[PDB]
Amino acid sequence: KKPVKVKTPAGKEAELVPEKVWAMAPKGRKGVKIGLFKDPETGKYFRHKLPDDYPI
């Protein structure tokens, strides 16, 4: 639910709340966290790395 600074497919930076988040690694095993985002301007979906202590 924490907003994140991401670059959109339109090439603008924005502070968005990811629609869905997860860590890319087996459950309990640690890896990079990824968010699914949606661009308010283009409507396009995109993914972006999340900050490491991001609440999953």
Partner DNA sequence: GTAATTAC
Binding site for DNA (CB under 7 A): 9, 19-20, 22-27, 31-32, 34, 36, 43-49
Q: CB neighbours of 34 closer than 8 A, spacing ≥ 6?
A: 21, 22, 23, 24, 47, 48, 49, 50
